[PDB]
From Swiss-Prot, chain B:
From-to range in the entire protein, with total length: 119 to 177 of 236
Crosslinked residue numbers (Glycyl lysine isopeptide (Lys-Gly) (interchain with G-Cter in ubiquitin)): 13, 31
Organism: Saccharomyces cerevisiae (strain ATCC 204508 / S288c) (Baker's yeast)
Protein name: Small ribosomal subunit protein eS6A
Misc. remarks from the entry: Present with 66000 molecules/cell in log phase SD medium.
Residues with Phosphothreonine modification: 45
Annotated function: Component of the ribosome, a large ribonucleoprotein complex responsible for the synthesis of proteins in the cell. The small ribosomal subunit (SSU) binds messenger RNAs (mRNAs) and translates the encoded message by selecting cognate aminoacyl-transfer RNA (tRNA) molecules. The large subunit (LSU) contains the ribosomal catalytic site termed the peptidyl transferase center (PTC), which catalyzes the formation of peptide bonds, thereby polymerizing the amino acids delivered by tRNAs into a polypeptide chain.
Swiss-Prot record, chain C:
Residues of the full protein shown: 1 to 126 of 155
Cell compartments where the protein resides: Cytoplasm
GO biological process, one term: translational initiation
Modified residues (Phosphoserine): 7
The protein's name: Large ribosomal subunit protein eL24B
Biased composition (Basic and acidic residues): 89-126
Assembly notes: Component of the large ribosomal subunit (LSU). Mature yeast ribosomes consist of a small (40S) and a large (60S) subunit. The 40S small subunit contains 1 molecule of ribosomal RNA (18S rRNA) and 33 different proteins (encoded by 57 genes). The large 60S subunit contains 3 rRNA molecules (25S, 5.8S and 5S rRNA) and 46 different proteins (encoded by 81 genes).
Organism ancestry: Eukaryota, Fungi, Dikarya, Ascomycota, Saccharomycotina
Miscellaneous field: Present with 36900 molecules/cell in log phase SD medium. There are 2 genes for eL24 in yeast.
Organism: Saccharomyces cerevisiae (strain ATCC 204508 / S288c) (Baker's yeast)
Family named by the database record: Belongs to the eukaryotic ribosomal protein eL24 family.
Amino acid sequence: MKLNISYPVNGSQKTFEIDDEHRIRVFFDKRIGQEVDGEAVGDEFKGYVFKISGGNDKQ
Amino acid sequence: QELEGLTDTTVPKRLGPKRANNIRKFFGLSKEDDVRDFVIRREVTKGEKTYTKAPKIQR
Amino acid sequence: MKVEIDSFSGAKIYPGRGTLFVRGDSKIFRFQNSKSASLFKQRKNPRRIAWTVLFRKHHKKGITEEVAKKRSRKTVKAQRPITGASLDLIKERRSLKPEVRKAQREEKQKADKEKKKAAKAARKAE
RNA sequence: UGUACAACGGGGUAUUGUAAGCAGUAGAGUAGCCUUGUUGUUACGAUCUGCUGAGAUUAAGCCUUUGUUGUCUGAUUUGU
RNA sequence: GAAUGUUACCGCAAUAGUAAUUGAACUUAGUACGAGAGGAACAGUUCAUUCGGAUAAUUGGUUUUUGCGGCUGUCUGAUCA
RNA sequence: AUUCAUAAUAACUUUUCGAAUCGCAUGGCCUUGUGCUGGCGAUGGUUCAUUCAAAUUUCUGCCCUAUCAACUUUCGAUGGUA
RNA sequence: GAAACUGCGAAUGGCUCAUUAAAUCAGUUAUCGUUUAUUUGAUAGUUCCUUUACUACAUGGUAUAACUGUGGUAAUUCUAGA
């Protein structure tokens, strides 16, 4: 899928296209407001923790 | 590890305050420090001429 | 193989098991067993049946999963660029709180110019 | 006279659908009380909630067992 | 089921009986054939019909498990049972 | 024509309204301070009135039918009290 | 001076005559039985709440659009995130 990730401190934002479904399966069964760490989905996001704010689906 | 597109780069707040007390708390000055001097101005280049358009002060 | 959920009891259905019912509005229901199917035919409600997941949910039994969402208390801690402020000079000017006598020094010349302009207008009126 | 057998028990899996008793500022409301109320308390009251996916039953043609207690020499017949 | 020396096991097989059946679709091919109209088949594959023999994982039925629960009337003083 | 208008007492209100608004002219007083006063307006606002209306409403008035003479009233139909 | 917010308006106008036969409607009354944006004219000295530091009254506070940029979907006067 795609991740629109925003670093509000600097005020920046960027898209990231992701594959490897069993990485992104972490996000499953979560609410908009919960947090997750990033090495589980990508080691580039090691030590990072993101919160969810929303999103869009197909259609 | 820092992300080239979000963490490394940083972006500006496109505007500054327009409200007086907002400025006073932005710079933490006083109830008396003559905010008219602490104004943010945005120089432009329409051509050879330039100007900064210090916006306004409501309240 | 997908593992489906009972429309009535919320229990889990493995393949080859239970039934599936299709109602005149083109809707689907999945039943694990003739028990659930029979109560559905008797048009009971699961919220009043005591062995159902919906019941246990609505009565908050085994509800130790969800706890709470905490409260955040933290400042921005980042002076961002105003894009016409030059954040270095902006920190220099936010640090210029003392020496406010320059404000009154400029106000003195401004007041002098005010009286000068009043006099000039009153004279040009003549 | 033993990875022996049985009867009981324990556990598993199943079925049903949340036991009795106790408590509750739950309860349609109603009588009565006096310290008269500043929820004032006492009696009635189907029912509801909690202890309670509890309790009960579970091999008679289910499974299993480091458990407890016992049983394990009676009669008859047969020959190239 | 007596008798074949007894008893037990593993087996041979004389004889007797016998069961599998039919169709459609796709492709073959709008090909062959024929002026055109129209219009096939063999092989292959997927299914089905009728019949039979077993089975009971699942679905369904059955329910004296009178297993669980509920309901009525009545009787056990009431409650429980 | 009134329990009208209005006023007064007792209180009540989760509390209403009572200008943190804006453009021009910029003027007068001085113990000359960014001192004190000061105009023409626009907007908005509580209530009364008015106007624009609106809703109900009085009286009287409507075509053919009797091969429609009985209708309404269960649960609103007529009226009364709240 | 585009855009966007705010305030107004969009309930006027225009079209048609299906329904509707004491219903509409006409003419005539009434509101001492009511609401009324708008106009128009009048119209708040009383609001510091233990109201002697409780206070900015040269005037108090938080958002948020537009905009920056990231994106979604086939599409729509769709939109989220920062």
